[model samples]
Target: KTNLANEDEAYEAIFGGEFGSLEIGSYIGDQLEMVTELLGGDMVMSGIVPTLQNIVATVTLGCRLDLKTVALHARNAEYNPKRFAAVIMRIREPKTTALIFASGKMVVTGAKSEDDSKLASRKYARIIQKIGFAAKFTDFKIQNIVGSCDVKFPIRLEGLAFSHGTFSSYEPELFPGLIYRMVKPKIVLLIFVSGKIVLTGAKQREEIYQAFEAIYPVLSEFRKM
Candidate 1:
């Protein structure tokens, strides 16, 4: 028993769960290469390796805005009511995008984390205040978060689409990937044949984790390998 316990590979392999979350390691490691195999490993795979691609958030500026005036003053702002009603603004520090509306409601996107999203939103609001509107941040909420990962193997889109018909769509003619909509966290997944998965529409990071966990088994079942 002692000798068996001393065998790290044997013990880990025998006791691992298939769906454990991942603990990130050196970025240079073989993380993506082992995804498919780790799916059925002894213990859980640990938190999966999904990378945050973008975060979309919404907030109220607590005052009315003039889109034309906003665009005229700010160096990084633009507005054209005929094409769109909102004033578009961008900043590079956190690398985010903000859509400012005349109604003082705003949408901020492109930040990689929640705190960064809020910071970016505040920056946008400050820009509005600078543009002559008495803007204050309120009703802040993260609308959606997008993440992506690779399963390291091709997937059978047809089989998955048919099996998850209620929540999946695959139109190779219109789009090359399979669209999988999960209900619990309400994330939409764009799964491609090259083993790549793009997840969006999550309000929180946990939702991303939950969505991935819920879908991993199904992904394995339809794996093309």
Candidate 2:
């Protein structure tokens, strides 16, 4: 592990996650080449590669995973009548958990679930639609549906990063420009700055403990700074 003091070195080290060969920007051009090959040489480059490069930039700078459900709290008086109704109408076929909670006034809570939660969310969305201005719903689950990472950076720092062998074809790519780089994580949690936490690949409790232990120090230090 190297201390971060210089921008050039820091950028190189962080971006090393993308190109394993330690060749700076080598994958950048190669990625473009692959895209060209797949889509044919005549296809115009639409800046997809550049956009992915930016995402890598953000992750390298400082992004860690946390395991917790994010809550979007909306007080009764602060509710938006028209927008709330519109959102309910739009999410009729959600695949995950979505819930609406209403108290003396109205409160909407969105939670994550497997199958049943999703079905219930649809029903709740309908109820919110019927009530309109009388309720408020906030989505507090995982944001950036695709950009979140389950790996904790600190655990990743501790030899766990090297635990996973070289990239192979057996593991599928979860999204464009992102391969399932590792699988040893017993519990994988991804937390965004927006307060949403996404859990994935977490089948064992031990994995969760390791993740918390590894990340706690980093979080505490950041808070002090």
Candidate 3:
């Protein structure tokens, strides 16, 4: 009896935290197969780990920047004030781009991880510093994180759309992917019939995983044979 309770607690611990509901049966009633696989860390349960496709982070330089000067001095930088107000700069190391604005604000894009995004932002700040601007990195925040994953099975898009019409949008004629807007996590997912999914608009990485967990069982229910 003690062993059984302890084992249950351990299992609970494995799936704990703020990742939303891990109870597979909550959305789909009593799925023994999924529960067992999840417990065993098997295929259907833990097979798909979302790959971070892109991250859009923002930071403040704490001082005004001369965009024209930045463009002229910084290599791999461009400024066309006629077309864009900000200076576009890119670095090869982390392979990310930055939009340096005159108002001491910056937007970093195309980074695959938070670490790389922060690193890229710091590099941009340093570039600004070297260009005779006292750019102090501050108020760094991740605005969005986009992630992708494949379930390795075809999904019945029509069925899912009809069932969860409020939370989902599927206009095959207009767009191939089903746009599922999750409520709790406040993240948007583009779900394709090929079982390829792209999760976006997440401020944190945890939201991505939480949104996925919330949608996985529903997707499984609409899985095409």
Candidate 4:
């Protein structure tokens, strides 16, 4: 009774909250896959797997920005007001791009996870702070999440479109991928014949997982094999 007393509790603690914030990236994919299986598996257990490719977020610096000044001073800034209103700034650490508007609103893209998004936002704010602006990080919100995966099997887009007429749109002559608008979680998946899937319009990572699980069976039903 002694060894088994805390066994289940220890197991849950290790894989539940402790590993929740872990990111499954290419570098750590192998290790994470082992941990995932040891944790009773994750999204991959559903047969079709998806990973977050991009995280789009908007943040407020809470202070007006002078585009010309920011561009002139920031290391990686490009400002052409005649072409666009916002000043484009890039940072190398997290490899993210920010569209800094004069109104203090910022659009941050190229982040792969929510943590990276916030980290990049704070870094950008610090950059401006060092540039002599009293910028405050506030109202940070994740606007969209884009995830992709390869199902490892071809799909008949035409058949999928025909069966799911209300939610599927396919016109190979115009676009190779089928546009699948999933309603439950409100995700738009671009399904290609080569088995690659691009899912967007998700506000949270959970939505991406939910949508993919919901659609995997439908995709299997139209498998080209």
Candidate 5:
């Protein structure tokens, strides 16, 4: 009995009213799963982990770059001038997606964390240097961060679209998810019928957390019963 009461107090340690009505359990579970997996421990945590799914960042090199040369010489690199001018590069460690341009600009995404994002950027720059370009890592900045999670309930997309017409765009024929644009925090959302929510266009982590909370009520009201 005492332990149960202590556990309640522990829950109160965080996930309190001050944090709003967000589901900290599921989010925490998601993080725990990731942490466990990284530690080579196995445990399937409940609910989806709302995490930084992607990071869109830009880096500039002072001198011009040779995309063709980079693609030709680098492994796991692709360049099709007819299709796209940028050299697409991938690294397995952090599982990053990078686009390298001839103009000495690079954009990378799909990093799990901000540190990993910056690390991926640096790795790409180093790869370019190894491939014969005088690539100087300059002006590296994280422009946008994308976070996503599952609300764990079905959503009435049609009703939501109609209710929030001004801020929402839904076209079932065009896309499977509803496009929601939030003005205050300046975030774009992809809301699905399966209760999957994607938050994007956030420059920092707090924006994602707050954006989810702000939309939770609207989503619950439209929850399919």
Candidate 6:
């Protein structure tokens, strides 16, 4: 009957070399059974252990959640003309998908359309430079892009990446028309954790479908593999 209130405590109890009195195997089995009931059945129990192992490995190794953090920099106070064009071009090829976060700053994600996204990013970087605002790209990473129906529990997993940037100035209207362009994304849940972000949502299949539809025409010019 270990009253492990937190994961850290659980770990300490389980692996602290104090298993003389505690039946570690039985304890783990009970916990697993409890989790199975919480998940609604024994059918998934077999998968639970492996799944948890994977999660533990990922989290312990500092893997990003589906939501992440990116830094934006501007060389000047005014919006750079090249910014919009660059972003459009980057997204035009759709290397992957992205979500844009402009919090006195801006961030982009989901460049599923690879070449298009790279081009757009480069273009936007130039625009930022042209506006007297230096721009930098950091923490380029992915979370999850899946259908909502596939989510089995109220508690779902997500991911993110973090990086820093430099800027000469700041602009308020750096991002516009970008949101509408990401048509398929039903929701973009941005979770704040210790000055960072974990972006979730986009669980519905339609979001991805719509996103492709919106970018397909623009990215048609890019060579595809």
lDDT of 6 by residue, 150-186 (tens): 1122211111111101111112132110111132354
Highest TM-score among the candidates is held by which one?
A: 4
| Model 4 segments more than 4 A misplaced | 1-47, 171-174
In order of appearance, the predictions have TM-scores of 0.75, 0.22, 0.77, 0.78, 0.75, 0.22
Model 2 poorest 10 in a row by lDDT? 50-59
Error of 4 at 206 (Å): 0.5
Per-prediction backbone clash count: 10, 1, 0, 0, 0, 49
Clashing pairs in 2: 101-107
lDDT of 4 by residue, 150-173 (tens): 788899888888899899887555
Between prediction 1 and prediction 4, which has the larger lDDT? Answer: 4
lDDT of each: 0.68, 0.27, 0.72, 0.71, 0.69, 0.26
Residue-wise C-alpha lDDT for candidate 1, range 58-126, written one tens digit per residue: 798888877778889988776655445566788998887777777788877767779999999999888
Model 6 global lDDT (CA atoms, 0 to 1):
0.26
Error of 2 at 4 (Å): 33
lDDT of 2 by residue, 140-200 (tens): 2221111122222222222222332342222223213212233445333333232122223
Worst 10 residues of 4 by lDDT: 20-29
Q: Candidate 1 — which residues are off by over 4 angstroms?
A: 1-47, 172-174
Order of candidates by lDDT, top first?
3, 4, 5, 1, 2, 6
TM-score of 5: 0.75
Candidate 6 residue-pair clash tally: 49
Model 5 ranges with Cα > 4 A deviation: 1-49
* Cα lDDT of model 5 by residue, 86-116, tens digit: 6678899788777776778777766768999
